[PDB]
């Protein structure tokens, strides 16, 4: 297999590779490679994350968080190749939406970390021109119901937005429960800093309540975890967020699309939710 | 009788038809009704002084004039335990049912109040107001398991550090029969008496307590109220609606020992700190 081939020369410079294997998650460019000593988590980049992710921008963020020991360790980022390899914890186990609300006292003090940390990451993230810039990706119509309406609904929070205040911190911006990942010692590790950028961390909060789905009471309980002085908490940024970020993952997802991805129905799923919250809201 | 006839020989330098005892949370306050003008006749003495700083209330009435949130004072004479106020002829004073239809207009004024960047004199610190009425009152707390509950409300001192304190002028005291509206439209905040040094959030949730808020009244109102420069806690709120009834009980048992009775205000305020205590 020519892939297998390409993985066993782009990781042979960090060594006897027995196995390799294709990973789920949101990109079929993930592969786990098996070597007698050690496993490596093999990333592929290529043509269609290009127009949203800065691999510049991303190597740099890398080598800034080190430090926190959040992430798990990076053996190779080479943005020629298009290729990221980095450490795999074996015997760890990837959270989801039922074991995430068990580790309150652990995701918590991460968010803190990183929400305190002063890193001045390379990436801002302002949603209104994130839409903006989906929306100029997207080559065909927008497939979703109602949108030029919807759209500027969304619009009008802008200037909410604005009167409550946006904070500006290094945020994780993607907190799907599959991204924290928990080792034998029982530390949480999080994951896949990709998106990461500059933004209010009431966006790290929504993401976290809406991607596994918190009922109300959970939230308020991991917010008595996450709040303090160096971590101010508005429930209503975050009712804002949860709706902007259901807005962008929907278009994200005709982008995705478009290049060859097909993620059956999460894009209008996210997108009619995105409809629920402003009519809640 | 002789009531009447100290009102007249003090608001006298001002200029009678009647005088009137209004009723709350004191006896001491009365209406005076005159040729041109209505009056509040405000009486104070030995039984609200080591509570209320009655020279630093006068200069916080000044210090705050400038909001225009108050009613006109014309006379506040220390010397003499008087002070004499416009009183607002044919206004609605708010009561817990009025003031939610209100938000537009009572969440302005707090925004103006805490954004006021003023500084007043008395700084409000909760756990030593505790301290303080402990203190004042000289028979026991009649309070049942007091020790108990009261080590458990000194538990929030920590909680609070940890979620941050701001330092704010504070009304102090957002009982909604405070709101009035004049028939001009205008609303008047009233009876700064407590007002100092605190957390806004204290405000919030006297407002929310004294009001008997639901959860989406709540909810409703600080999304009036919420801004980048007035920002809200809910934790915050939920604990300073705890200490409040602990202090106002414990303000109550020192009224009630100067022989004042207020029914079962105090008792009923305590044990609703202890129940929020139940459900924090």
Same mark, same amino acid.
């Given at each position: 297999?020519?892939?297998?081939?390409?993985?066993?020369?782009?990781?042979?410079?960090?060594?006897?590779?027995?196995?390799?294997?294709?990973?789920?998650?949101?990109?079929?460019?993930?592969?786990?490679?098996?070597?007698?000593?050690?496993?490596?988590?093999?990333?592929?980049?290529?043509?269609?994350?290009?127009?949203?992710?800065?691999?510049?921008?991303?190597?740099?963020?890398?080598?800034?968080?080190? &430090?926190?020991?959040?992430?798990?360790?990076?053996?190779?980022?080479?943005?020629?190749?298009?290729?990221?390899?980095?450490?795999?914890?074996?015997?760890?186990?990837?959270?989801?939406?039922?074991?995430?609300?068990?580790?309150?006292?652990?995701?918590?003090?991460?968010?803190?970390?990183?929400?305190?940390?002063?890193?001045?990451?390379?990436?801002?993230?302002?949603?209104?021109?994130?839409?903006?810039?989906?929306?100029?990706?997207?080559?065909?119509?927008?497939?979703?119901?109602?949108?030029?309406?919807?759209?500027?609904?969304?619009?009008?929070?802008?200037?909410?937005?604005?009167?409550?205040?946006?904070?500006?911190?290094?945020?994780?911006?993607?907190?799907?429960?599959?991204?924290?990942?928990?080792?034998?010692?029982?530390?949480?590790?999080?994951? &896949?800093?990709?998106?990461?950028?500059?933004? &209010?961390?009431?966006? &790290?909060?929504?993401?976290?309540?809406?991607?596994?789905?918190?009922?109300?009471?959970?939230?308020?309980?991991?917010?008595?975890?996450?709040?303090?002085?160096?971590?101010?908490?508005?429930?209503?940024?975050?009712?804002?967020?949860?709706?902007?970020?259901?807005?962008?993952?929907?278009?994200?997802?005709?982008?995705?699309?478009?290049?060859?991805?097909?993620?059956?129905?999460?894009?209008?799923?996210?997108?009619?939710?995105?409809?629920?919250?402003?009519?809640?809201?």
């Amino acid at each position: 297999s020519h892939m297998e081939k390409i993985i066993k020369e782009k990781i042979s410079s960090l060594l006897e590779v027995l196995s390799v294997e294709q990973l789920g998650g949101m990109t079929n460019q993930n592969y786990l490679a098996k070597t007698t000593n050690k496993q490596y988590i093999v990333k592929f980049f290529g043509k269609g994350t290009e127009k949203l992710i800065n691999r510049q921008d991303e190597k740099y963020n890398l080598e800034l968080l080190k &430090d926190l020991g959040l992430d798990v360790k990076n053996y190779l980022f080479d943005i020629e190749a298009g290729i990221k390899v980095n450490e795999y914890i074996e015997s760890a186990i990837t959270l989801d939406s039922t074991s995430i609300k068990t580790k309150f006292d652990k995701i918590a003090p991460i968010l803190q970390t990183i929400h305190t940390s002063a890193k001045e990451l390379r990436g801002e993230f302002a949603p209104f021109e994130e839409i903006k810039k989906y929306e100029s990706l997207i080559e065909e119509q927008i497939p979703y119901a109602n949108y030029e309406s919807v759209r500027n609904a969304v619009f009008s929070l802008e200037k909410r937005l604005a009167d409550l205040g946006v904070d500006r911190k290094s945020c994780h911006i993607d907190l799907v429960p599959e991204n924290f990942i928990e080792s034998p010692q029982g530390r949480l590790y999080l994951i &896949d800093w990709e998106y990461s950028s500059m933004n &209010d961390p009431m966006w &790290d909060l929504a993401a976290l309540f809406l991607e596994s789905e918190f009922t109300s009471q959970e939230e308020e309980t991991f917010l008595s975890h996450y709040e303090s002085d160096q971590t101010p908490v508005s429930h209503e940024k975050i009712a804002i967020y949860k709706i902007l970020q259901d807005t962008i993952w929907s278009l994200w997802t005709v982008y995705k699309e478009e290049q060859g991805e097909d993620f059956g129905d999460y894009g209008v799923n996210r997108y009619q939710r995105a409809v629920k919250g402003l009519a809640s809201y």
